C-alpha cells in the first residue's frame, strides 16, 4: 500500500515528485510520460497509487482515469492539475480520481494526499 505510479510527460516534476515520494516514506513503483503508457504500467505494475497530471488536456489524462477504473475499479488515483484548472479537476474527480494536487507542488499537501487515499 505504497507504491506509486507517477504520471507526468515533464521529466523535472517527476524528479520532484518522486523526491518528495520518497521523502514521505512512499515507493515509485515506476513512472510514466501520459495515460496511454500509464494504463500499461498500471497493468503490470499494479501500484498501489497513481499520480496523474492533467495540466495538458490535450493530453487526454482523463481518459485514461477511467480506462484504468474499468481495469481496476478500486484503483487510488490523485490528479496534479495547475493553478485555474477547477473544471478539469471537478471531470477527474467524477471519473473516479479520489483527490488532488495543485501545481508548483507543495510538500505537505502532496504527503497529505498520498496519506488521506490509504
Request: aromatic letters at 4%; proline letters at 4%; glycine letters at 6%.
Amino acid at each position: 500500500g505504497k507504491r506509486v505510479l507517477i504520471v507526468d510527460d515533464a521529466a523535472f516534476m517527476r524528479m520532484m515528485l518522486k523526491d518528495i515520494i520518497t521523502k514521505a516514506g512512499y515507493e515509485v513503483a515506476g513512472e510514466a510520460t501520459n495515460g496511454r503508457e500509464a494504463v500499461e504500467k498500471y497493468k503490470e505494475l499494479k501500484p498501489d497509487i497513481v499520480t496523474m497530471d492533467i495540466t495538458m488536456p490535450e493530453m487526454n489524462g482523463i481518459d485514461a482515469i477511467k480506462e484504468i477504473m474499468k481495469i481496476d475499479p478500486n484503483a487510488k488515483i490523485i490528479v496534479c492539475s495547475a493553478m485555474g484548472q477547477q473544471a478539469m479537476v471537478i471531470e477527474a474527480i467524477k471519473a473516479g480520481a479520489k483527490d488532488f494536487i495543485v501545481k508548483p507542488f507543495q510538500p505537505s499537501r502532496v504527503v497529505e494526499a498520498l496519506n488521506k487515499v490509504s
